[PDB]
Amino acid sequence: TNPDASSSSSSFAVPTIHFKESPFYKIQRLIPELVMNVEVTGGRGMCSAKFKLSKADYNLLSNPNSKHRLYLFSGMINPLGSRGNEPIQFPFPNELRCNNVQIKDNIRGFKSKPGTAKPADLTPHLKPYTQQNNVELIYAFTTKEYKLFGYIVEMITPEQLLEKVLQHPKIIKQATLLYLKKTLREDETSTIMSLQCPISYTRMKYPSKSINCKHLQCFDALWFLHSQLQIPTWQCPVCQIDIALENLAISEFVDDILQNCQKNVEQVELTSDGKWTAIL
Ligand SMILES: [Zn+2]
């Protein structure tokens, strides 16, 4: 069922499913055979799939230090939101098996997300190159339909992403100075700023914040990213606002003080001027 006389995607039929992305993994290839459907049943039900890894595929996954993995995703055919921004959601309760082994809902990070809300790592249970693989999802008591996909994804590392932040135009000193003055105006002067990260409670090494952040206090981009990988909130640790990876930049002002202060100083006194002095 679909409109024969149209013009664009806006007017067609069945928006293609696209799982909400994470900067920690990148969907690279779809293993075609690994596509199952979960039906509506008041009892038990299951879907299986058999697939053999091609030459090109088995590779990325093989190597001992390979940043590639085979993830199984699940989403609803009729989600609350949009299929174009599909939430990862497996039916509950369920039991996933790969080549007769049960797959614990444990992957790299995302430890804050229950198992039904994150992809499943099939990789450590694949059979050798030339040898069919079997995946089986056992579910029960489903009121909605779900569709699963098998994707070879590339693990993106916290330090790799840090590189993207360092390669992003920093927040130049002039900006910080203008803010520091706008700040110091509303009074009843100097402000005390910490060189410590709110995330690590340790000396910062990569001072940062969203360019959208209205505050002097930065946080360590490395810790922020290691924190997001485990507990994906994507919220500033200081002002709690929503921040996107692309808007994360190093603060040149804070970086300067940090790269020119005694390894044991934990705070710095700032004057309307813009100059600073370590608080020993
Ligand atoms: Zn902020």
| Residues 137 and 186 occupy one common structural domain | no
Annotated binding site for Zn(2+): 213, 215, 236, 239
What's the Rg (C-alpha) of the chain?
24
Ligand 1 centroid to 209 CA: how many Å? 6
Bridge partners of 194, per DSSP, are 267
| Residues 53 and 129 occupy one common structural domain | yes
Of 106, 134, 155, the domain-final residue: 155
Ligand 1 centroid to 210 CA: how many Å? 6
| Residues 150 and 161 occupy one common structural domain | no
| Residues 177 and 111 occupy one common structural domain | no
Ligand 1 centroid to 155 CA: how many Å? 27
CATH number assigned to the domain comprising residue 227: 3.30.40.10
Is residue 236 within 8 Å of residue 213, measured between CB atoms? yes
Method of determination? X-ray
Give the span between the Cα atoms of 43 and 116, in whole angstroms: 19
Question: For the chain, what is the largest distance between any 2 Cα atoms, rounded to a whole number of angstroms?
Answer: 76
| Residues 134 and 228 occupy one common structural domain | no
| Residues 145 and 162 occupy one common structural domain | no
**What are the structure tokens assigned to 52, written together?**
């053999």
| Residues 10 and 119 occupy one common structural domain | yes
Q: Which domain holds residue 7?
A: 1-155
| Residues 143 and 170 occupy one common structural domain | no
Bridge partners of 192, per DSSP, are 269
Ligand 1 centroid to 82 CA: how many Å? 29
Resolution, given in Å to one decimal, reads 2.6
Is residue 3 within 8 Å of residue 42, measured between CB atoms? no
The domain tally of the chain equals 2
- The CA distances from residue 159 to 84, 183, 188, 224, 241, in Å, are 29, 33, 44, 11, 23
According to DSSP, residue 184 is labeled H
| Residues 113 and 178 occupy one common structural domain | no
Give the span between the Cα atoms of 238 and 217, in whole angstroms: 7
Of 108, 129, 155, the domain-final residue: 155
Phi, psi of 41 (to 5 degrees): -150, 145
